[PDB]
Amino acid sequence: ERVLCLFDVDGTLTPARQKIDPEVAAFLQKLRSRVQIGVVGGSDYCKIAEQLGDGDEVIEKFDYVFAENGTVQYKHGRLLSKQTIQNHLGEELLQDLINFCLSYMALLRLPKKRGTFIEFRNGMLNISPIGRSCTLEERIEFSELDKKEKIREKFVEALKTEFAGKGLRFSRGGMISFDVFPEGWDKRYCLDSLDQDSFDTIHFFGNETSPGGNDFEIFADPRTVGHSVVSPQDTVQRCREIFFP
Amino acid sequence: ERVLCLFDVDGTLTPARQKIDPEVAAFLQKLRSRVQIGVVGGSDYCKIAEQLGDGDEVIEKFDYVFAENGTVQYKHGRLLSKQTIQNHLGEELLQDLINFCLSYMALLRLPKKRGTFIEFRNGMLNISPIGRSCTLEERIEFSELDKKEKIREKFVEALKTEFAGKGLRFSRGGMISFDVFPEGWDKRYCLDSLDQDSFDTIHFFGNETSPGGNDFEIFADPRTVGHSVVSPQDTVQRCREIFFP
Ligand SMILES: [Mg+2]
Ligand SMILES: [Mg+2]
Ligand SMILES: [Mg+2]
Ligand SMILES: [Mg+2]
């Protein structure tokens, strides 16, 4: 009878990278009268916050906010400390990775390069051949070339082989980047903390729950009751059926 | 009888990287009753702003704010547009530079690497072997090793030779980095805009006015009356002598 509803954000609660619909937002607060609610997203906290309210409203509107897949956690309004990727991987593998990337990207010739080719986050390294400090038009330009030349895909193939057996995973970061993260630091990461919070049931809702999707692992994990949705409206209706029948 | 007093910030108006003394700040506002006043600094606007007031007070307290040596300019409260380094250098030299740096740093093995090894600014590229996303203790650790191994100094020697004749200049960026900027984009850069503003006299005040110092060029430029100071109190007294005799 302690229940948590845990939601992916993009395509589950909001249009991708955009603000939640007030009606959906209103339902979630009602749902809170029956269960605790939480969000888990790959984006950083500032982005998620911006999609789910004004200011830091989000940490008050939700019982849990898991940013960067739960490597950053807010619990009932309070920021918890997070394990760092350097602490987890150790400095030597981390620098091996970094130097391989620097070396690989040195040899890539693009139309434009900018800066912040490697962004050190909590949950991962974000790798971007063009550089994260590019403009929107520059992103589209890179994106178009990337499809033609498989720039990010070939980079990732080289990295996976190079680091075979060493516990690194890779995922697409939009148009211009990819993430490198430790094995297990997908959305499931947040389930480890949730494990200590005495929930009787954790319901997870996501829109990418098929193999390869960024919700697959947390959806399939035996610690969650999994729910597959196709839209914020679908998520609301599913919740109505389960919790307000 | 249109006069501008233009001040370096660090060691000229404030302790380096710290907040201005209220008494100095008070005098500068008085000085404004006789002349226009402006600041020019290598740091970015957010840093300079933070040293010179709360919020964006600075653009109201000074007639001109030249951040990153004037590549960013506020004039009487208004942000002016700025030429970009890519526009000035062109994409091919820019990427030649970037790829040389990526390649060089790939081969450097440090105690720790983080991220943002190349930060694209308006006025320059900031190059950091450890990565700009490191903590203060990590900066000191790098700093100590850098002195032992001449990491940044050797990097810069290699860059200068490689790009000989191509109009690039280099300067120390604290403990962990160096800047790469186009020839002429030292503090003198701000004098070009000032040239169109019909000042009868521009007085420049700086604490690094000897050859090699970051105020030397603007101090020595024939467009300024140069003043060499050793402290914020010295700057105030010099101004008193000249403008309130
Ligand atoms: Mg989604
Ligand atoms: Mg499950
Ligand atoms: Mg100074
Ligand atoms: Mg002069």
Q: How far apart are CA A116 and CA A192, in angstroms?
A: 31
Catalytic residues of B: 8, 10
B204: exposed, middle or buried (Cβ count in 10 Å: 0-12, 13-18, 19+): buried
Shortest distance, CA A110 to any CA of chain B (angstroms) = 8
A-B CB pairs within 8 A amount to 75
At residue A207, what are phi and psi to the nearest 5 degrees? -105, -5
Q: Round to whole Å and give the CA distance between A142 and A136.
A: 10
Gap between the Cα atoms of A26 and A236, Å rounded:
10
- For B99, residues 6+ apart whose C-beta sits below 8 A from its C-beta are A106, A107, A108, A109, A113
Whether B109 contacts chain A with CB within 8 A: yes
CB spacing of A114 vs B102 below 8 angstroms:
no
The torsion angles phi and psi of B176, rounded to 5 degrees, stand at -120, -5
Å resolution of this model? 2.1
State the Cα–Cα distance between residues B12 and B96, nearest whole angstrom.
37
CATH code assigned to B1-83+186-245? 3.40.50.1000
Cα–Cα distance, A135 to A208 (Å, whole number):
28
CB contact under 8 A, A106 and B109: no
Structure tokens given for B55: 């919020």
B133: its two tokens: 């996303």
Method by which the coordinates were obtained: X-ray
Order the strands of the B78-80 sheet from edge to edge. Answer: B78-80, B72-75, B64-67, B36-40, B3-8, B201-206, B225-228
SS3 label, residue B225: strand
> H-helix or E-strand containing A99?
helix A91-106
B10 annotated binding-site participant: yes
Type of residue at B242? I
* Tokens encoding B159: 């860059």
Q: Is A123 on the interface with B (CB under 8 A)?
A: no
Residue B186 contacts residue B214 (beta carbons within 8 Å): yes
Residue B56 to residue B79: CA distance in whole angstroms = 12
**Residues of chain B found within 8 Å of residue A120, distances taken between Cβ atoms:** 114-116, 131, 133
Report the C-alpha gap between B32 and B27 in whole angstroms.
9
At A7, list the tokens: 């939601």
Parallel, antiparallel, or unpaired for β A78-80 and A118-120? unpaired
Q: Which helix (H) or strand (E) holds B139?
A: helix B136-149
Q: Is A223 annotated as a binding residue?
A: no
Question: What residues of A are annotated to the active site?
Answer: 8, 10
Can you say how many angstroms the Cα of residue A169 is from the centroid of all Cα atoms in its chain? 13
Q: Which residue has the tokens 């800066």?
A: A115
Tell whether B93 lies on the interface with A, counting CB pairs under 8 A: no
Residues of chain B with CATH 3.30.1240.20: 84-185
Identify the nearest ligand to the CA of A219 by its number.
Answer: 2
Angle, to 10 degrees, between the axis of helix B22-31 and the axis of helix B232-243? 20
| H/E run at residue A182 | strand A177-182
Residue A80 CA, ligand 3 centroid: distance in Å = 40
The residues near A151 (Cβ < 8 Å, ≥ 6 apart) are A108, A110, A129, A145
Write the DSSP symbol of residue A208: -
- Cβ of A113 within 8 Å of Cβ of B125? The answer is no
Cα torsion angle, B66, B68, B70, B73, sign: negative
For tokens 């690094």, the residue is B208
Rounded Cα distance between B120 and B86, Å, is 10
CA distance B196 to A20: 49
Residue from A241, A245, A233, A242 nearest A22 by CA:
A233
Place of tokens 């203060």: B136
Chain B neighbors of A95, CB-CB under 8 A: 109-110, 112-113
Q: How many other CB atoms are there within 10 angstroms of residue A39's CB atom?
A: 28
CATH code assigned to B84-185? 3.30.1240.20
Contact A104, A178 (CB under 8 A): no
Place of tokens 């000191």: B140
- Secondary structure letter of residue A21 according to DSSP: P
